Every structure is written in structure tokens, then in C-alpha cells.
Structure 1
Amino acid sequence: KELIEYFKSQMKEDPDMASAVAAIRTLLEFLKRDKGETIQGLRANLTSAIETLCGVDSSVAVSSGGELFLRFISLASLEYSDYSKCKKIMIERGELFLRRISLSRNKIADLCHTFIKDGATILTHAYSRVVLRVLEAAVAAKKRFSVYVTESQPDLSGKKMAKALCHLNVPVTVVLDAAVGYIMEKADLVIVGAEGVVENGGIINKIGTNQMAVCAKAQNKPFYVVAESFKFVRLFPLNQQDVPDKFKYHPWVDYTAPSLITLLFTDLGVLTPSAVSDELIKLYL
């Protein structure tokens, strides 16, 4: 409560980056705190309670990312010989975690952009913060293609992708939300950002995903998804009722069925819809 105002300052002081990374930046900058002078209660229970307080938003990525950097501090914040440099001075490992998953956007931009086939148009979903940089690195390497955006309509959000893209002279056309079945034959392959990736291999994202995937299966066309290291989770859906209700909110975010996707990208690298499981089990030993 007393530092969720700084999370508000981090969400609306630099609105370029993601929400979860603003939460991680918020709390790790708070680790110059009023000195609790302990390892157990401070780290475990206090950052647990801070995950409970900052999870009051309708996000799914933020709480999972908080648990994730709790696991990325559970590595070797050791019992090293004195309470002077356990973590409250030897703090730079979470700093290098922050730096690595800051440059993770750049390494996804370096990897994925050399896959887009020139000539076949690619309809994209609403504004993510990794589709923009992969298209930036693609058009930076002198391609030719077309791109459409659906609105993803609880609110108009496709034109926000238009005001994102059109600033750098790339052709685009916004298309109706329920009418992606008409445009599905026109496109040949379909990329979509993530609010988070599930252990079964499906994605969770704002609502307009699963109908894109099932029209992709009907047109037998490759469905492509993109995510970063922040957006892993431990949830398990079978049919849609079992995403958690605080992670549901007429859904404001939504799951798509796990393996009628065709290929998936992450910061660990480009991988396969069963490799998702073992490569997240690699995290949190």
C-alpha cells in the first residue's frame, strides 16, 4: 500500500515498457528499504505480501513475474558468512536479471524478424510491446509485406496499433473484430503477442486469440505466438472455466487451446508445443 503509489509512478512515468517489468523495477528499487535486518521474514514473507498488494490490478503477468523473480532470487541469495552482504549489499544479481530481461526484447527482435515471408500478408492482434519491435527490426532489414490489425473490441485497440505502426511509414489497414473469418484466407500466417504463456503450450492474451487459432486450423495455416521471459505462469486450463477469476477480469484476457498453435518464440529461444513444459520446468528448480 505504501509503495503501490511508486508502482503507479512506474506505470505512468515511462509508458513504453511493460507492466510486470515496472513492478519488478519498483520492488527491486525498493530493496534500499527501511532495514528489516533479516533474511527469512524480509525476503520470503515481505516480498510475498508485496506480491499480494501489487496483484490487486487485473493483470495476470505481474503476479507471475513477481513469483518469477522470487525464483530468480531464490538461486544463490546465500547465507554467506555475515549479515552484511547477503543480498542487501550483494544485490546486483537481480540487477543483472533486470538488465538481461531488458535486453531480452532486443534479442527477440534480433531472432524472430528473419522469419516473416515476404509477400503473404500477416494479420496481427491488438497492440503488444514485442510485436512492434519485431516489425521494426523486420522493416529495418528491408522487407515487403502487408499487415492488418483486428480491433480486439471491449475497446478500440487496433487503431492504437495503427498509431504505433504508421509513425514509421509501414502500410496497414484496421479490420473488423468479428469479421476475421473473411480476412483469414487473405493472410497466410498469423502472429500474436502474449499476456502470458501457459504450461500446456497455449497462450493467455486479450480475447481475440482462440478464434484466430481455430480459423488458422480450418485454413490449415501456421499460427504463431510470441512471448518473453517475464510471461511464464503455472496455470492449467482444459476448457476456459479454470483460468482464475481474478486472472479473468466478459473476459478481459483469455486462453487459447494449447497445441493448435504451430510454433512459439521466447527468450529461451524458438521452441515446440511440448518443449514449453520442460523449458519452464528448467526455471524454478
Structure 2
Amino acid sequence: FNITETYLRFLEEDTEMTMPIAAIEALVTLLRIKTPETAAEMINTIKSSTEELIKSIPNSVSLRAGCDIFMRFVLRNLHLYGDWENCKQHLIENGQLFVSRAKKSRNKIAEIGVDFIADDDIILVHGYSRAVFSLLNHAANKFIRFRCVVTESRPSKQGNQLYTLLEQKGIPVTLIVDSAVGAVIDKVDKVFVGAEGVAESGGIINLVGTYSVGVLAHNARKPFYVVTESHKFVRMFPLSSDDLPMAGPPLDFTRRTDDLEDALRGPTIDYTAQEYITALITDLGVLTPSAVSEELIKMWYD
């Protein structure tokens, strides 16, 4: 029936219905066809389909995290030794209810996380996430004053994409390069960052220059933010500053070339430590440091 093909069908779609929540919805559809009653026939084939999904992954982490939560919920269903049919019906229904929960959480956060942006504050935003931009839009809906500074992120020219999406709202902006980002931290009140993953330790899994932002802000004593939806938690512990799951290059040094083809290669995903984050915002209340780990301990029961 395929799961990778179902995820590939979301091209012109996206937004509101997030990338992990679309992968979880694809997991439920694959589950509900071939009988969820048998725990031997099904769970092994679910594990093989997740393994096939990881093998097809080029540069994504959150899909592996979203599978875990699904699994957990499935196992927790028949924890009460209930009817092997009513528990199954509740499991299949919690697929559309999972995607509906992405709406309710966004409704919660955009009313909680507007409080952090005070009267007339200049913001420097880096790493686009659906939660952080939803804060930015629903604060403009609240009729509050805020200035915005665009960071020139270089994965697939994300800065320009961010700049255009800010233009469609009615908030004054200008381009700032990630090289010169050090020269901005004095006229900026607060620095906001949207995450691709949050660590077991309390650190962050993010894009092509976020650790660099974290350190500079720690030097300038100016606050550093993480805002996300509560599903991007893996049991991952990057021990060092440059160690991450990759399908591509971990810093390659190429031979002598004249035609100029082999060059670009640099760490596209970078880690930052727990100390650099001043504040974290999710739908699971207002909490930052060890909170993430408590969540993970609460899930894994280990």
C-alpha cells in the first residue's frame, strides 16, 4: 500500500497539517487496512515500513520522532486489558484526532506565546517554524507593535522565502546576512528560533547556522527563544558539537579541481547546548530546560 508514496503526495499541500503529523496520518492508514488485532502480523510490518522510511530519508529527523509517539499510543491503548475491538476502534480514530490536535495546540500556543513579545520590541528571527510564525501573525491580529529582522539562512535560500511570507502580512522588514548577524545584537531586543528537533539533554537540532546565533546572544546577554509544536522529541543525545544522524557529508575535503564542481560541502544541520536557550515554548505549558527530558522519561517509562 506504501507509506513513502503517501508522504510524497503532499507537494502543493503542507501548512497547518505539519510534516510529522502527515507521516503519523500515513502510519494510521497503513495500520487500519491489514487488521490491527494481530500484534505479531502487524507491528513487525509497521517496524519494517518505518525502517524503509528511515532508509529513504535524506535530511529529516522529526519523522523518526513522530513514529515513536504513534507506537507509544498504540501500545497504551490495550493497557487496561479492554475489549480487543473497542480498543482497536479507539486506535484507528486517534489518527484523524491526532491531526485535529495540531489545530488545537496551535490555538493554544498563539494565545500563550504572544505574551513574550512586549510593547515595541525589535525581533531577529531565524529558522522558520509553523509555530513561531503563527505567534508572529496572531500578535499582529492582537494589534501589538513589533519590528522584524530577516536572517539570510542558506539551506535552499530560506531567508528569501521567510522575507516574502512576512511581506504578505504587513510588518516592516530588511535582509540581514548570517555573517553580519553579530553586528545586529544591540538593536535587537529578542532572538527567536524555531526548531527541527529538541534534545534529550535540553539542546537543539536545527539548520545551517543556529548554534552561532546561540553563542553570540549568550555573549550579548540578549534572550534566545525556541518555539515549536510538541511532537519533535527524539531519544537523541548528541554528545559533541558536531555529531548528528546524516545521509550525506560529515565535512568533506575535496581534491584539486579546475572546472569548479565540488565545493559547497558544509554542516547543514548543527547542534547547540542546553545553556544557550533562555526560554522554550510549546503547547505543553510554558517550560524550558529539564522539562523536555521529563517529557521523554514520562513517555519511554525508562
Partner of 1:80: 82
Q: Which residue of 2 aligns with 1:212?
A: 213
Deviation at 1:89, TM superposition (A): 6.8
Q: Percent identity?
A: 42
Question: Aligned AA for 1:135?
Answer: L
- Tell me the SS of whatever aligns to 2:178: coil
Q: Is this contact kept in 2: 1:125–1:152, CA < 8 A?
A: yes
Please list the CA deviations of residues 195-252 of structure 1 after superposition, one character each: whole Å capped at 9, or x if unmatched.
0111111111112211111111101111111122110111112322332234988222
**1:69 is aligned with what amino acid?**
F
User: Does 1:124 find its partner at 2:140?
Assistant: no
Measure how far apart 1:134 and its partner are: 0.6
Map of 2:234 onto structure 1: 233
Cα deviations by residue, 1:32-76 (Å, 9 ceiling, x for unpaired)? 32447512330x212211211222222101111111211122212
Letter in 1 for 2:199: V
Using a 3 Å threshold, how does the CA distance of structure 1 residues 4 and 95 change in structure 2: closer, same or farther?
same
Deviation string, structure 1 residues 1-60 (Cα, Å, up to 9, x no partner): 833211111x31512232211111112123332447512330x21221121122222210
Evaluate the alpha carbon distance shift between residue 20 and residue 108 of structure 1 in structure 2; reply closer, same or farther with a 3 A threshold: same
Partner of 1:269, secondary structure, is coil
Q: CA deviation at 1:122?
A: 0.8
SS where residue 168 of structure 1 aligns? Answer: coil
Which residue identity does 1:74 align to in structure 2? Answer: L
Q: CA deviation at 1:193?
A: 0.3
Contact 1:109–1:137 (Cα < 8 Å) also in 2: yes
C-alpha distance in 1 between matches for 2:94 and 2:116: 33
TM (norm. structure 2) is 0.85
- Match of 2:257? none
In structure 1, the residue matched to 2:44 is 45
Q: Which moved more, 1:270-279 or 1:219-228?
A: 270-279
Q: Is the 8 A contact 2:64 2:234 kept in 1?
A: no
Contact 1:192 1:224 in 2 (8 A): yes
Runs of 5+ unmatched residues, structure 2:
251-265
5+ residue gaps, structure 1, are: none
Q: Does 1:276 align with 2:292?
A: yes
Deviating beyond 3 angstroms after TM superposition, the runs of 4 or more aligned structure 1 residues are 34-37, 77-82, 246-249
Q: Indicate whether 1:257 and 2:256 are aligned.
A: no
Query: Shift of residue 145 of structure 1?
Result: 1.7
Aligned length: 282
Code of the residue aligned with 2:217 in structure 1: it is A
Indicate how the Cα distance of structure 1 residues 53 and 76 shifts in structure 2: closer, same or farther if over 3 A, else same: same
Superposition map of 1:126-165 within 5 A: 126-165=127-166
Q: How does 1:14-33 map to 2 (within 5 A)?
A: 14-16=13-15, 17-33=17-33
TM-score normalised by the chain length of structure 1: 0.90
The structure-2 alpha-carbon separation of the partners of 1:162 and 1:241, relative to structure 1 and needing over 3 Å to count, comes to closer
Alpha-carbon separation, structure 1, partners of 2:292 and 2:33:
37
Partner-residue secondary structure (3-state), 1:242: coil
CA deviation string 1:74-127 (max 9, x = no partner): 212455344x44426752234433322332122111210121022221100132
Change (3 A) 1:197 1:188: same
CA contact (8 A) 1:132 1:164 kept: no
- SS across alignment from 2:222: coil
Q: Contact 1:32–1:88 (CA<8 Å) still a contact in 2?
A: no
Change (3 A) 1:41 1:127: same
Contact 1:236-1:243 at 8 Å conserved across structures? no
Most deviating of 73-82 and 154-163: 73-82
